[PDB]
DNA sequence: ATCGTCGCTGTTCAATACATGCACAGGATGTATATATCTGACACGTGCCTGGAGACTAGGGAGTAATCCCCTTGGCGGTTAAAACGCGGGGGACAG
């Protein structure tokens, strides 16, 4: 089981040259909670994991 | 213009393959050993005789004491060459 969270924005507000950046969790039980987003489509969209 | 993306490259980092130093099984060649076997050289027994043993003598070689003096030890001192100590360095030893 895994899931994805789509975030459609109206303007670029990250680093365009970076396709993905990680976010560590505070605890071990929630390590797989929103740990990585993605950028690789035309529209400014982030894909949470 | 203005931003993003797509063709063209280098530079570094990591992964892999090769080369070099080291130990440990593996065989084969010789040595040691196990065994069977047959031999002739050693040990003994016998028989025979020459060299060792016994008994005696005579005689001189050696042991023994008594005397001699030569040779060896010993102490002393005086110049004196030889031994001893030290220095410096060179060539001979010894290892790679």
UniProtKB/Swiss-Prot annotation:
Tissue expression pattern: Ubiquitously expressed.
The protein's location, in the record's own words, is: Nucleus; Chromosome
Superkingdom of the source?
Answer: Eukaryota
Q: How is it modified after translation?
A: Acetylated by KAT8 in epithelial but not in mesenchymal cells, thereby regulating the epithelial-to-mesenchymal transition. Acetylation by KAT8 reduces KDM1A association with nucleosomes, thereby decreasing histone H3 demethylation, leading to transcription activatio of target genes.
How is this protein induced?
A: Down-regulated during neural differentiation in neuroblastoma cancer.
Assembly, in brief, is: Component of a histone demethylase complex with RCOR1. Component of a RCOR/GFI/KDM1A/HDAC complex. Interacts directly with GFI1 and GFI1B. Interacts with INSM1 (via N-terminus). Component of a BHC histone deacetylase complex that contains HDAC1, HDAC2, HMG20B, KDM1A, RCOR1 and PHF21A. The BHC complex may also contain ZMYM2, ZNF217, ZMYM3, GSE1 and GTF2I. In the complex, RCOR1/CoREST strongly enhances the demethylase activity and protects it from the proteasome while PHF21A/BHC80 inhibits the demethylase activity. Interacts with the androgen receptor (AR).
Function description: Histone demethylase that can demethylate both 'Lys-4' (H3K4me) and 'Lys-9' (H3K9me) of histone H3, thereby acting as a coactivator or a corepressor, depending on the context. Acts by oxidizing the substrate by FAD to generate the corresponding imine that is subsequently hydrolyzed. Acts as a corepressor by mediating demethylation of H3K4me, a specific tag for epigenetic transcriptional activation. Demethylates both mono- (H3K4me1) and di-methylated (H3K4me2) H3K4me. May play a role in the repression of neuronal genes.
The linked condition is: Cleft palate, psychomotor retardation, and distinctive facial features: A syndrome characterized by cleft palate, developmental delay, psychomotor retardation, and facial dysmorphic features including a prominent forehead, slightly arched eyebrows, elongated palpebral fissures, a wide nasal bridge, thin lips, and widely spaced teeth. Cleft palate is a congenital fissure of the soft and/or hard palate, due to faulty fusion.
Write out the similarity annotation: Belongs to the flavin monoamine oxidase family.
Free-text domain note: The SWIRM domain may act as an anchor site for a histone tail.
Q: What is this protein called?
A: Lysine-specific histone demethylase 1A
Give the organism the record lists: Homo sapiens
Q: Which gene encodes it?
A: KDM1A
Full-protein interval shown = 658 to 706 of 852
């Amino acid at each position: 089981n895994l899931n994805k969270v789509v975030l459609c924005f109206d303007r670029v507000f990250w680093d365009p040259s970076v396709n993905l950046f990680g976010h560590v969790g505070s605890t071990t039980a929630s390590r797989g909670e929103l740990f990585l987003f993605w950028n690789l489509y035309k529209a400014p969209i982030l894909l949470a994991l």
